[PDB]
C-alpha cells in the first residue's frame, strides 16, 4: 500500500535573546540509511524579519513554507503592506496546519 | 426591461446610480474625525409619535474599534454589518490582532458590485464606518454602493447631506477636540433636520482609542444639546 | 408580435420560426435529387463553386454518416455540417449500444426527434435545413428518407428537394406514372445515376459538365461519393446515346 | 421587425441577422490573407500604426496553434484571440487521445462548430471576425477561411478585412498564372506584395507588415514567424511592385 | 440605440454599444500616463477626490515584485481586474518559479475581459490599464481596454485630455526612450507629460502619484511627501 | 437574452394585486359550479359538467369530484390537468402523513400544505400559478366535517357551504338565504341541486351534467363512508327531490 | 449559454385565457380527421393519411401507432408532436408501470400519464405545449374497452364515439345519428369508414386510410406459444387489403 | 433556476416592487397592537363580505410562534404562512442551540432579515406582509410590541396599527395613547385597542378579533360576547 | 447511560432512569435526568451511545414542539412513537446511525389510557405494559412477569419499581447511582423526589 509519508530526518533549534532570535538547522536530508543531500537549507527567510523551519517530512515542510511565504506576500496585498508580527504569523500558521487537521503536514515547525 | 448590469451611455451603471437616489431620501448620518477620537451622529425620524425612537438603530458596533452609520434603505445595511463583524472577528482569529479601519471597509465594499443576472440589486444604504487603528490611527469612510470609498476628515451623507457637507467644509480643522466635534455634529444636524433636534430623535457616539466605540445614552447627548444651545447664545 | 421570434404558437397556430428556417433552406440556391435502383440508391446534388480561390473539393453538401449511411444536406453549410457530426455521432452510438448498424430510417427518425425539440423548446433555434438520408439498408433496401425543420419525416421511392424542386417532383412522378415500378429498373449503380442526371437536366432545363454536379452512391455495405472523373465518365455516356 | 435585436432569431427571409452584423465588424477591421503553396501556406497580415508609441514588432497577430497551424483573423481582435484559445484546446484533446496531431481539415471543423454554436442561442453573441488559417498535416498543405456564420472552406488563397476585394483580385491572378503552383518563398513575396496593395484600402495610417509560414521543405512542416533578412527581402519585393 | 440593451447585441454597423459606453467611464476618469526606455518603466497619475474633506483616489496598483498597473474609470473593476493579475503572477512562481511575462500579463487581461463581452447577464469591465513591468525581455509598458484590445508601448496615457499627454509623448519620443540608468530623469519626463493634461489645477503633494519598476528596482509607489521632489 | 419573452408571473400591480392569480381565477369563473355543503352528519359535494356531448361516456368519467383518501375528496373548479397535478401532491401527502405517524391526516394541514405549493407557484419560479381552486370536504377526530377552498393565490378558508367556478354570486346568495346550523345531510343535498338548477348556464339540470358526492358517518358505528354517486344515483336523487 | 428560460411561456390572459393552449387546439382544428368508434366488443380508431406527396411512401408514416399490446393511438393536429409523444407515451407504460407490476397500465392510467407529460409542456419553462389532440383506443381486464381524448392542455374524457380536426364538427353529428350501446365491432367499423368518406376528399381506399382496432386477443400475432396466460395483442392494424374489403359492402 | 431581478432601483430611487407590497397591505384587514402597562393586546378585523364562513377552522389572524409571542399581520393571507412558518421553526432552533426561547425583538428581527432577503434575491417577489409582532422576553415582564414590513425594516411601538383605514386608527390612538400612563390593566388595553377597530371597523359583532398576551406565555383568545361587550358597553358611554 | 425501566399501569405510566455518567474509571456525574418531555402528556428516556443520546433527544423534543405550535394540538403518545420510530429506521441506514434506545411514556388524553413504548436504535417499536433497555430487561423483565399486574395504581407501580431498582442494585455489575422516576398521567408529568 502507498505511504505518502517519509522521514527526510535531520533537527532543527531555535534560541530568542534579548533583541536577537536565532534559528538554526542542519543541512544534511536523508532517506532510511542513505544520505540524500549533504547541503539542502531548511531554514528560510520569508521577509518581515521571519525565519522558519518544518523538519520532518521535507515534501510537506516545504509545501508549508512556500504556502507560509505566500501568505505572507498576500497579507501585504490585502492590509496596505502592514508588517506580519511575529505572534499573527504564528496565528496564521496554526490555520495553515490544523486545515490540514486530517492529513497532517508530517512536521515540527518553529519560526 | 434592461439587464441590471447595464452602462448607461455616459459610461454609469443604472442601478447604481439609482440606488444613490435612494440613499438622497435617507436620513442625515454625519461624521467628523479628530485626533482625539472620531464622532458619528445620527437623524432618527421617527415616522410617528407612538413609534419607540430608541429601538431605531441607525448606529452600529462593527467591532470595538470600530463602528458604523448608515442612511437610506437602512433594512439592506443589516447583512452589510454581519459581514464586517465576521470579517473583523474573523481577521483576530486568523491573525490574532485587530483588523485595520481600512481593509475592514475594503471587504465591506466588496460585496458593493456583487449584484447582477450574487444578489439581484445594488445596496440602498451608504455607510459612514468609523475606527481607530496603530497604523493609520483614527479614520472615516464613506462606503457607497458602487464599491467605491473614500476617507474623510468630516462627511454627511442623507436627505441633508450638501447643505452639510457645504457647513463641514467651513467648520472642520485638524485641531477639533472630540467635545468640539460632537457640538459640531449636532449643530449640522439640527440645522438639517425638519423636526426639531433632541436627545430623542438624534443619537450621537464616538470612537476613541482608550474606550472603544460607544453610543451615547439620550441623558448625555440631552446635556451636550444643552450646552451647545447655551454656547449659541452667548455671542 | 414576439410569437415570431421563439418557437411558440401563433393565433393562427403556426410556427414561424420553423416556417422561416424552411425558407433558409433555399438560402445556398442548391437542389438535390434522390432516386433508389434495384440494387443501390443514388443521390445527386448541383454543385456551385462561384469563387475562383475557393478549393471545389473542399465544397460538398453530401456526408458520409457512416459506412452505409450518406446524407445530402439543402441549406446553409453551418447548419449542414452540425447536422452531419450530430449524425455520425448517433449512428456510432447506435452501432456501440445495439450490436448493430443504424438503419437509415431509424437515423432518420433520430434526427428529426431532435429537430423536433427545437420546434417545441426555445432556447434552441431550428436549423435550417433539410436533411436527405440514403442507403441500401439490409432489412428494406434501398432507402431515401428525408427530415425538415419541423421535425417530419418520410420515406420515398424518389425525392428532390431545393428552389426548384417542384419541376423535378413532377418530372419524376410523371416517369414513375409511366414506368409504373418505385424505382428504377437497372442493374449497374452507374445507369441510375445516368438515370438522375438525365432527369434532373430534362426538369431544370441546364446542361452539366463534371463541376456543376455532386454524386453520392448508396451500395450494400458501402456508401461513396463520387469523383469528378467518375461523374465525367457518366456524363460522356449520357451523351453517347 | 424586431428580427435582427436577438441572436439566432430567423428573419423572414430564413436569415439571422446578428451573424450579417458581427461580419460588418469584420469589414471593418485590417487586411489580413492567406496564400497556399507547393508544399504549405503563408500567412500574413496588416498592422495598422496608430502612433509612433506602438513599439515595432512587438504586437503579434498571427497566432500558432499547436505546432502545425497558423491562423491570423480580422475584426474584434479579442474575438480572435478567443476562438485561438479554444482552437488549441481542441487540438490538444485530439493529440491527448489520437496522439497524431490534428489535421488541418479536422481542426476546421472543430472552429467551425464552435463558431456555429454561437449562432443557435439569443444568451451568446456571434463571433466578430473572420479567420485564416491552416498548416501541412500527412496529406499536405491545406488552406482555410472561417466567418461569423460558422461556414469554412478549402481555399488556393483567401482575404478579409477592409480591403478584401483589392487582395482577392490580386490572389486570382495568382491562380490563373501559376496552375502547376507557387513556391513558399515565392509565396511570402506575393503575400507582402498583397498587403501593400490591400493597404490602399486603409491608406491613412501607415502600417507594420506581419508574414508566418509553414512548408514541408522549407520549414520543416511547423509554423514560423518570417523575420529579419527574409521579411526585409519580402517588403522590398512588395515596395519595389507599389511604385 | 436599439441595440445597446446589453453586450451580446450587435448594432447593424458591427459595433457593441456596451462596450463603447464602458469605454465612455474611462474618457471621464483621471488622466494617468505610462511611459518607458530600455531599463526602467514608469506610471505617473493624477489622483482625484470627492471634495476638500476627502481622500485622493489611488490610481496605482502593485501586482508583483516586478509588475503593477494604474487605472481610469471604475475602480472596483481595477481591484478585479488587478485582483486577477497578482494571481496568474502568482501562480506562474508557484507552479513554475518563473515570473510572468509582461506581454503573457497583457494577454490574460484581454481573454478576462473579452468573455465579458459575449455572454448574456455580464457587462464590460468600466476601466482602462496601463500596466508597466520589466521581465526577461527588459522594461514594458501596456495599454488595457476594457474592448479587451491590449497594446504594447514606449509611452502612453488614458482618461480625460490624455491626448495632451500622447501627443508630448510623442514628441518626446526619442529623447525619453534613451532615459537608461536614470530613474529620476524619466519619471520627470513622465511628470512633464501628465503636466500636458492639466487645466486649472497644477500638481500638488496628495495629488500627484508615480510608479517605477526597473533593471535594479522592485515595483515601488511613491505618494504624499516622496513626490514633492517632481513638483 | 431570454428577458424579452418573460411574462413576469410573479409580480405585484400598482394597486398591490397579483396580475396572474386575478387572471387565473378568471379564467375559474367560466368553469363549472361546485357547490360544498355541511351538515351536522356530514357534508355534500356538487358539481356542474362543462357542456357535456351526448356521445361522452358519463359513468367512466370523473372531471370535478376526485377522491385523495378514504376520508377526504375534493371538487374542482379550473383547468383538470393542473387539478389532478395538485391531486396526485395531495394524495401522496397523506400517505406520508399515515407512514409517519399511523394516523389519518387532518384535513386541515392537507388543506395547508397543498394551498402552500400553489402560494410557492405565485411568489418564486417565474411559471404560471394553476388556474385551479378546490372545495375540500373531509372528515377528522379533531373538528369533525369541514369544508374549505382554496384558490390560485394559495389563500384556503373553511366554509358551512361554499361554491366555486361559474356564478359563484348567485350561488353564494342562494346559499346564505336557505342554510341553517341544524340542516342535515338529506336536506343539504337538496339544498345543493336546488342552487345548481337555478344558477345553471344550461336549460335545464339533468343527472348526465352532475357529479354528486356524500361523506356521511351514515357507516356502521363511528366511521366515515365516502359515496361518489354513480349516475342512475344521481338520477334517482334528482327524481326524489322533483327537479326532473 | 444554457436554457434561460426558466419561466412559463403559457400564462394567463386578462379574459382568463391561456393562449397558447387556445392556439395549439386551433392548429388541432387544422389537422387532418381522426376518429374513434366503441363498440361492445371492441374500438375502433381511423384516419386519412394525407400523403406529402405522391413520391412519398405513406406505409413507412404511421399515424396510428401501437402503445401497449392493448391499447392504440391516433392523432390531429401536428405529427411530429405526436410521434415524439408516441414514443414517451410507451416508455412511460413501462417505467412507471410494467417495470413496477409486472403488467401493462390500463388504459385510463396510461392516458392518464401522457396528460401529465402535456400538462406539463403547459405549465414548465421555456417550452410550448403540444399541437396535438390524441384519441386512445384500448382495452384492460378491470374496465374493459375504452376510448379517450386528449387535448393540448392536458385534459381527457372518456368517449362512446367521436372525431377530432378538420371536419370533426360534422363527423362528430354523423356519429351521434348511428351510434347505439349494442353495436358490434363490426358495425363500429362499417361507421368509422363511412363518416371519414365525408371528411376526405381525394382517393378513399386502404392505401390513404388508415385504421386500427382494440378486440379479440390475437394469438397468431404473439410471436409464441407455450405460457396458457400470455394470448396475444388486442390491438390491431387492418391491412390495406383489409380495408378494401369493407369499401365494397359499404 | 429562475433567475430575473424583479426588485430593482427606477430613475428616482425606488424599488417599485416593495412599494406595491406595501399597497397589498394596504388592501390587507386592519390589525392594531397596543401594549398596556403589564400586557400587549392585538386586536383584527375581520370583513363581513363572507357570512356562511366556519369559524372553528378558518385560519385565525393572530398566531403563536411559540407559547410566550404571537404574530397578527397585514396583507396577503397565503404570504403570511410562509413568515409565520419559518418564525416558528427559528423558535424551536433557538431553544434548541441557546437553550432559551426567542426575545421578541429577535423573533422579529429574524422575520424581517427573511422580508429583507427577499427584496434583493434574484427570481421572489417581495412579500405582501407587514407584521405586528407582541410578546414578553423569557423571565421578563415588560410588553413588547414589533411592526416589521416588506421592505424589511422594523420597530417598536407603543402602539400601532396596520392594513386598510390604518391611517384613521393610527390618528385614533396617537390622541388616545398617554406614553406616560398606558392602559393599566388588561380591561383597559382590551377597550382601547376595542375603541380604535371601532373607528374603522362597521358592526362590532364577528367583525372584530381580540387576543390577550400576559407575561410568562400567557397568551388567551377572547370570544364574540366577551368582545361584545367592550362594543356594547362603549357605545353607552358614546351616547352623551 | 445504562439504565432505563418503564412500567405501565391502571392510570399512569412510571419511567426510572439511572442517574450515573460514567466515562472510563470515573463516575463524572451521579444527578443526570435521562429524559426530556416531548409534550405535555408524553416523556421520553434515552440511553446509548455518548453525545448521541442527548442530541437526538433534544432533536425530537424540539420537531414535537414545533408540530405543537403549528397545529395548537398535541400529538397522540402513538403518533409521537411512530415519528421516533422512522426517525431511527432512517437513521440506521445512515453513514453515522444515532446509537440511541429510548423509552416512550404518554397519557392519551383522547383514550385516557396511559402507553409505554420500547424503541431500539434500529428502530423497533413495541407497544409493552413494561419495558427495559439494555442488561436491565435481563433481572427486570422475569421480576415484572412474576409480581405485575394491569390493573394496579400508581403506588402500587412506585413499589413495583422499588423491587425492580434493588434486584438491581443487589446483582448488577456497575454503580448507577440510583434512578429518577417520573410519572405520566391525565395531569401531565411530575417528577418523584424522595426514590
Not at chain 5, 71 to 92: K, T
Not at chain 7, 81 to 101: E, F, M, N, P
Request: aromatic fraction near 8%; charged fraction near 25%; glycine fraction near 8%.
Amino acid at each position: 500500500q502507498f505511504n505518502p509519508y517519509g522521514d527526510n530526518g535531520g533537527t532543527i533549534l531555535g534560541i530568542a535573546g534579548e533583541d536577537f532570535a536565532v534559528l538554526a538547522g542542519d543541512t544534511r536530508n536523508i532517506t532510511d540509511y542513505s544520505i540524500n543531500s549533504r547541503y539542502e537549507p531548511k531554514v528560510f527567510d520569508c521577509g518581515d524579519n521571519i525565519v522558519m523551519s518544518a523538519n520532518g517530512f521535507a515534501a510537506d515542510g516545504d509545501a508549508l513554507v512556500k504556502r507560509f511565504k505566500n501568505s505572507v506576500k498576500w497579507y501585504h496585498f490585502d492590509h496596505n503592506d502592514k508588517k506580519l508580527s511575529i505572534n499573527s504569523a504564528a496565528r496564521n500558521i496554526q490555520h495553515l496546519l490544523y486545515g490540514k487537521r486530517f492529513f497532517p503536514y508530517y512536521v515540527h515547525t518553529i519560526i | 426591461d434592461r439587464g441590471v448590469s447595464t452602462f448607461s451611455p455616459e459610461g454609469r451603471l443604472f442601478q447604481v446610480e439609482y440606488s444613490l437616489e435612494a440613499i438622497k431620501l435617507g436620513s442625515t448620518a454625519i461624521g467628523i474625525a479628530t485626533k482625539e477620537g472620531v464622532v458619528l451622529g445620527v437623524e432618527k425620524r421617527a415616522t410617528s409619535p407612538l413609534l419607540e425612537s430608541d429601538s431605531i438603530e441607525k448606529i452600529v458596533e462593527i467591532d470595538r474599534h470600530i463602528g458604523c452609520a448608515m442612511s437610506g434603505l437602512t433594512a439592506d445595511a443589516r447583512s452589510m454589518i454581519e459581514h464586517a463583524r465576521t470579517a473583523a472577528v474573523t481577521h483576530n482569529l486568523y491573525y490574532d490582532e485587530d483588523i485595520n479601519v481600512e481593509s475592514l471597509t475594503q471587504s465591506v465594499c466588496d460585496l458593493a458590485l456583487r449584484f447582477g443576472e450574487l444578489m439581484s440589486r445594488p445596496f440602498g444604504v451608504a455607510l459612514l464606518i468609523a475606527g481607530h487603528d496603530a497604523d493609520d490611527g483614527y479614520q472615516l469612510f464613506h462606503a457607497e454602493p458602487s464599491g467605491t470609498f473614500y476617507r474623510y476628515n468630516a462627511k454627511a451623507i442623507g436627505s441633508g447631506s450638501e447643505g452639510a457637507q457645504a457647513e463641514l467644509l467651513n467648520e472642520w480643522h485638524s485641531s477639533l477636540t472630540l467635545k468640539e466635534a460632537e457640538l459640531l455634529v449636532l449643530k449640522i444636524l439640527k440645522q438639517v433636520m425638519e423636526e426639531k433636534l433632541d436627545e430623542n430623535n438624534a443619537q450621537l457616539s464616538c470612537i476613541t482609542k482608550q474606550d472603544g466605540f460607544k453610543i451615547y445614552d439620550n441623558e448625555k447627548t440631552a446635556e451636550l444639546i444643552k450646552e451647545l444651545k447655551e454656547k449659541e447664545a452667548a455671542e | 408580435g414576439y410569437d415570431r421570434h421563439i418557437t411558440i404558437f401563433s393565433p393562427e397556430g403556426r410556427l414561424y420560426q420553423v416556417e422561416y428556417a424552411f425558407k433558409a433552406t433555399n438560402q445556398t440556391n442548391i437542389n438535390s435529387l434522390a432516386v433508389r435502383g434495384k440494387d443501390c440508391t443514388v443521390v445527386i446534388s448541383q454543385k456551385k463553386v462561384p469563387d475562383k480561390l475557393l478549393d471545389p473539393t473542399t465544397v460538398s453538401y453530401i456526408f458520409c454518416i457512416s459506412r452505409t449511411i450518406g446524407m445530402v444536406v439543402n441549406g446553409p453549410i453551418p447548419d449542414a455540417r452540425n447536422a452531419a457530426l450530430r449524425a455520425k455521432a448517433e449512428a456510432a452510438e447506435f452501432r456501440y449500444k445495439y450490436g448493430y448498424d443504424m438503419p437509415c430510417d431509424v437515423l432518420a427518425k433520430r434526427m428529426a426527434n431532435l429537430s423536433q425539440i427545437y420546434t417545441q423548446r426555445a432556447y434552441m433555434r431550428p436549423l435550417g435545413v433539410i436533411l436527405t438520408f440514403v442507403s441500401v439498408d439490409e432489412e428494406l433496401g434501398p432507402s431515401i428518407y428525408k427530415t425538415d425543420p419541423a421535425g417530419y419525416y418520410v420515406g420515398y421511392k424518389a425525392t428532390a428537394t431545393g428552389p426548384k424542386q417542384q419541376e423535378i417532383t413532377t418530372n419524376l412522378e410523371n416517369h414513375f406514372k409511366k414506368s409504373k415500378i418505385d424505382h428504377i429498373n437497372e442493374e449497374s449503380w452507374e445507369k441510375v445515376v445516368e438515370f438522375a442526371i438525365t432527369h434532373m437536366i430534362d426538369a431544370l432545363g441546364t446542361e452539366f459538365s463534371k463541376n456543376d454536379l455532386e454524386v453520392g452512391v448508396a451500395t450494400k455495405d458501402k456508401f461513396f461519393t463520387l469523383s469528378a472523373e467518375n461523374i465525367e465518365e457518366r456524363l460522356v455516356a449520357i451523351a453517347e446515346q | 421587425t424586431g428580427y435582427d435585436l436577438s441572436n439566432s432569431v430567423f428573419s423572414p427571409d430564413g436569415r439571422n441577422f446578428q451573424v450579417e452584423y458581427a461580419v460588418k465588424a469584420v469589414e471593418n477591421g485590417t487586411t489580413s490573407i492567406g496564400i497556399k503553396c507547393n508544399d504549405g501556406v503563408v500567412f500574413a497580415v496588416e498592422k495598422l500604426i496608430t502612433s509612433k508609441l506602438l513599439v515595432p514588432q512587438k504586437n503579434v497577430k498571427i497566432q500558432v496553434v499547436d505546432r502545425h497551424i497558423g491562423c491570423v483573423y480580422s475584426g474584434l481582435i479579442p474575438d480572435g484571440r478567443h476562438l485561438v484559445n479554444r482552437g488549441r484546446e481542441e487540438a490538444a484533446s485530439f493529440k491527448k487521445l489520437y496522439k497524431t496531431p490534428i489535421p488541418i481539415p479536422a481542426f476546421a471543423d472543430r472552429l467551425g462548430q464552435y463558431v456555429q454554436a454561437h449562432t443557435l442561442y439569443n444568451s451568446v453573441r456571434p463571433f466578430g471576425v473572420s479567420t485564416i488559417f491552416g498548416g501541412v498535416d500527412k496529406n499536405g498543405a491545406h488552406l482555410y477561411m472561417l466567418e461569423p456564420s460558422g461556414s469554412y472552406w478549402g481555399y488556393k488563397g483567401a482575404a478579409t478585412g477592409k480591403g478584401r476585394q483589392s487582395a482577392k483580385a490580386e490572389l486570382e491572378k495568382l491562380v490563373d498564372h501559376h496552375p502547376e503552383g507557387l513556391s513558399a518563398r515565392e509565396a511570402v513575396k506575393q503575400a507582402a506584395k498583397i498587403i501593400y496593395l490591400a493597404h490602399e484600402d486603409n491608406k491613412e495610417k501607415d502600417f507594420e507588415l506581419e508574414i508566418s509560414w509553414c512548408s514541408l521543405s522549407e520549414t520543416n512542416g511547423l509554423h514560423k514567424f518570417v523575420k529579419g533578412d527574409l521579411l526585409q527581402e519580402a517588403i522590398d519585393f512588395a515596395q519595389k511592385e507599389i511604385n | 440605440n436599439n441595440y445597446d440593451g446589453d453586450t451580446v447585441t450587435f448594432s447593424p454597423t458591427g459595433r457593441l454599444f456596451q462596450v463603447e459606453y464602458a469605454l465612455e467611464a474611462i474618457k471621464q476618469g483621471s488622466v494617468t500616463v505610462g511611459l518607458r526606455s530600455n531599463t526602467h518603466a514608469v506610471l505617473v497619475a493624477l489622483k482625484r477626490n470627492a471634495d476638500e474633506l476627502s481622500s485622493y483616489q489611488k490610481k496605482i496598483i502593485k501586482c508583483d515584485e516586478h509588475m503593477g498597473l494604474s487605472l481610469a474609470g471604475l475602480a472596483p473593476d481595477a481591484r478585479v481586474l488587478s485582483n486577477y493579475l497578482r494571481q496568474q503572477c502568482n501562480y506562474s512562481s508557484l507552479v513554475f518559479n518563473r515570473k510572468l511575462a509582461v506581454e503573457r500579463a497583457g494577454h490574460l487581461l484581454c481573454d478576462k475581459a473579452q468573455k465579458n463581452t459575449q455572454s448574456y447577464g455580464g457587462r464590460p469591465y468600466g476601466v482602462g490599464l496601463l500596466i508597466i513591468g520589466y521581465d526577461k525581455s527588459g522594461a514594458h509598458l501596456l495599454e488595457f481596454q476594457p474592448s479587451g484590445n491590449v497594446t504594447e508601448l514606449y509611452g502612453t496615457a488614458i482618461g480625460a485630455r490624455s491626448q495632451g499627454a500622447k501627443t508630448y509623448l510623442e514628441r518626446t519620443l526619442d529623447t525619453f526612450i534613451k532615459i537608461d540608468g536614470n530613474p529620476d530623469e524619466l519619471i520627470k519626463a513622465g511628470v512633464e507629460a501628465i503636466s500636458q493634461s492639466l487645466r486649472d489645477e497644477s500638481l500638488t503633494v496628495d495629488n500627484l502619484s508615480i510608479a517605477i519598476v526597473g533593471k535594479d528596482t522592485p515595483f515601488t509607489i511613491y505618494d504624499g511627501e516622496a513626490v514633492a521632489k517632481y513638483i | 437574452g431570454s428577458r424579452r419573452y418573460d411574462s413576469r408571473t410573479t409580480i405585484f400591480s400598482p394597486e398591490g394585486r397579483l396580475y396572474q392569480v386575478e387572471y387565473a381565477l378568471e379564467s375559474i369563473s367560466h368553469a363549472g359550479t361546485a357547490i360544498g355543503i355541511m351538515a351536522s352528519d356530514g357534508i355534500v359535494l356538487a358539481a356542474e359538467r362543462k357542456v357535456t356531448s351526448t356521445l361522452l361516456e358519463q359513468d367512466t368519467s370523473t372531471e370535478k369530484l376526485y377522491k385523495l383518501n378514504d376520508k377526504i375528496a375534493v371538487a374542482v373548479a379550473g383547468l383538470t390537468a393542473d387539478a389532478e397535478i395538485l391531486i396526485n401532491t395531495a394524495r401522496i401527502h397523506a400517505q406520508n402523513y399515515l407512514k409517519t405517524y399511523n394516523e389519518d391526516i387532518p384535513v386541515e394541514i392537507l388543506v395547508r400544505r397543498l394551498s402552500d405549493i400553489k402560494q410557492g407557484y405565485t411568489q418564486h419560479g417565474g411559471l404560471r400559478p394553476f388556474g385551479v381552486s378546490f372545495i375540500y370536504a373531509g372528515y377528522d377526530d379533531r373538528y369533525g366535517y369541514q369544508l374549505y377552498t382554496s384558490n390560485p393565490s394559495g389563500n384556503y378558508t373553511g366554509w358551512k357551504a361554499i361554491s366555486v367556478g361559474a356564478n359563484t354570486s348567485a350561488a353564494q346568495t342562494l346559499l346564505q338565504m336557505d342554510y341553517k346550523d341544524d340542516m342535515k345531510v338529506d336536506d343539504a343535498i337538496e339544498l345543493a341541486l336546488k342552487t345548481l338548477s337555478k344558477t345553471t348556464d344550461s336549460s335545464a339540470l339533468t343527472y348526465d351534467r352532475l357529479e354528486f358526492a356524500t361523506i356521511r358517518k351514515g357507516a356502521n358505528d363511528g366511521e366515515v363512508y365516502q359515496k361518489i354517486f354513480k349516475p342512475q344515483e344521481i338520477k334517482d336523487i334528482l327524481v326524489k327531490t322533483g327537479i326532473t | 449559454m444554457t436554457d434561460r428560460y426558466s419561466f412559463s411561456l403559457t400564462t394567463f390572459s386578462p379574459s382568463g385565457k391561456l393562449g397558447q393552449i387556445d392556439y395549439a387546439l386551433t392548429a388541432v382544428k387544422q389537422g387532418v380527421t381522426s376518429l374513434g368508434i366503441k363498440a361492445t366488443n371492441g374500438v375502433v380508431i381511423a384516419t386519412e393519411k394525407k400523403s406529402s406527396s405522391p413520391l412519398a411512401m405513406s406505409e413507412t408514416l404511421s399515424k396510428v401507432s401501437l402503445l401497449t399490446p392493448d391499447i392504440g393511438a391516433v392523432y390531429s393536429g401536428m405529427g411530429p408532436d405526436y410521434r415524439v409523444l408516441v414514443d414517451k407515451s410507451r416508455k412511460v407504460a413501462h417505467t412507471s408501470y410494467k417495470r413496477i407490476y409486472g403488467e401493462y397500465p390500463p388504459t385510463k392510467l396510461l392516458v392518464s400519464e401522457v396528460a401529465k407529460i402535456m400538462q406539463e409542456a403547459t405549465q414548465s419553462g421555456g417550452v410550448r405545449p403540444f399541437g396535438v389532440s390524441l384519441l386512445i383506443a384500448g382495452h384492460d381486464e378491470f374496465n374493459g374497452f375504452s376510448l379517450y381524448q386528449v387535448d393540448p392542455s392536458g385534459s381527457y374524457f372518456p368517449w362512446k364515439a367521436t372525431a377530432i380536426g378538420k371536419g370533426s364538427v360534422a363527423a362528430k353529428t354523423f356519429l351521434e345519428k348511428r351510434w347505439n350501446d349494442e353495436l358490434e365491432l363490426e358495425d363500429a367499423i362499417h361507421i368509422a369508414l363511412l363518416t371519414l368518406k365525408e371528411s376526405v376528399e381525394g382517393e378513399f381506399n386502404g392505401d390513404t386510410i388508415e385504421l386500427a382496432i382494440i378486440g379479440d386477443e390475437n394469438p397468431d400475432l404473439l410471436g409464441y406459444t407455450g405460457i396458457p396466460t400470455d394470448k396475444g395483442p388486442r390491438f390491431r392494424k387492418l391491412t390495406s387489403q383489409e380495408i378494401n374489403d369493407r369499401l365494397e359492402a359499404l | 433556476g429562475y433567475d430575473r431581478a424583479l426588485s430593482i432601483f427606477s430613475p428616482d430611487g425606488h424599488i417599485f416592487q416593495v412599494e406595491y407590497a406595501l399597497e397589498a397591505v394596504k388592501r390587507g384587514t386592519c390589525a392594531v397592537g397596543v401594549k398596556g402597562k403589564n400586557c400587549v393586546v392585538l386586536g383584527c378585523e375581520r370583513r363581513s363580505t363572507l357570512k356562511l364562513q366556519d369559524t372553528r377552522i378558518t385560519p385565525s389572524k393572530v398566531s403563536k410562534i411559540d407559547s410566550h409571542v404571537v404574530l397578527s399581520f397585514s396583507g396577503l393571507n397565503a404570504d403570511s404562512r410562509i413568515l409565520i412558518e419559518k418564525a416558528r421553526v427559528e423558535a424551536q432552533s433557538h431553544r434548541l442551540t441557546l437553550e432559551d426561547p426567542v426575545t421578541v425583538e429577535y423573533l422579529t428581527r429574524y422575520v424581517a432579515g427573511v422580508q429583507q432577503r427577499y427584496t434583493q434575491s434574484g427570481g421572489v417577489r417581495p412579500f405582501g406582509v407587514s407584521t405586528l409582532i407582541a410578546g414578553f422576553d423569557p423571565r421578563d415582564d415588560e410588553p413588547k410590541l414589533y411592526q416589521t414590513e416588506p421592505s424589511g425594516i422594523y420597530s417598536s411601538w407603543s402602539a400601532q396599527t396596520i392594513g386598510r383605514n390604518s391611517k384613521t386608527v393610527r390618528e385614533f390612538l396617537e390622541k388616545n395613547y398617554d406614553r406616560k400612563e398606558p392602559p393599566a390593566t388588561v380591561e383597559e388595553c382590551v377597550k382601547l385597542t376595542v375603541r380604535s377597530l371601532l373607528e374603522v371597523v362597521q358592526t362590532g359583532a364577528k367583525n372584530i378579533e381580540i387576543t390577550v398576551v400576559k407575561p410568562d406565555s400567557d397568551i388567551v383568545a377572547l370570544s364574540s360576547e366577551e368582545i361584545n361587550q367592550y362594543v356594547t358597553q362603549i357605545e353607552q358611554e358614546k351616547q352623551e | 447511560m445504562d439504565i432505563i425501566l418503564g412500567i405501565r399501569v391502571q392510570d399512569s405510566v412510571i419511567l426510572a432512569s439511572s442517574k450515573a455518567v460514567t466515562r472510563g474509571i470515573s463516575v463524572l456525574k451521579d444527578s443526570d435526568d435521562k429524559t426530556r418531555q416531548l409534550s405535555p402528556h408524553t416523556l421520553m428516556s434515552f440511553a446509548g451511545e455518548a453525545g448521541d443520546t442527548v442530541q437526538f433527544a433534544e432533536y425530537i423534543q424540539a420537531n414535537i414542539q414545533l408540530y405543537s405550535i403549528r397545529e395548537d394540538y398535541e400529538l397522540s403518545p402513538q403518533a409521537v412513537s411512530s415519528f421516533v420510530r422512522q426517525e431511527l429506521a432512517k437513521s440506521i441506514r445512515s453513514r453515522r446511525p444515532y446509537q440511541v434506545n429510548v423509552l416512550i411514556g404518554g397519557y392519551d388524553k383522547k383514550k385516557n389510557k396511559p402507553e409505554l413504548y420500547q424503541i431500539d436504535y434500529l428502530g423497533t417499536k413495541v407497544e409493552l405494559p413494561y419495558g427495559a433497555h439494555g442488561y436491565s430487561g435481563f433481572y427486570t423483565f422475569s421480576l415484572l412477569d412474576h409480581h405485575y399486574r394491569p390493573d394496579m395504581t400508581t403506588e402500587e407501580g412506585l413499589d413495583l419499581l422499588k423491587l425492580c431498582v434493588q434486584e438491581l442494585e443487589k446483582r448488577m455489575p456497575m454503580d448507577f447511582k440510583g434512578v429518577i422516576v417520573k410519572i405520566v398521567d391525565k395531569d401531565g408529568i411530575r417528577q418523584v423526589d424522595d426514590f
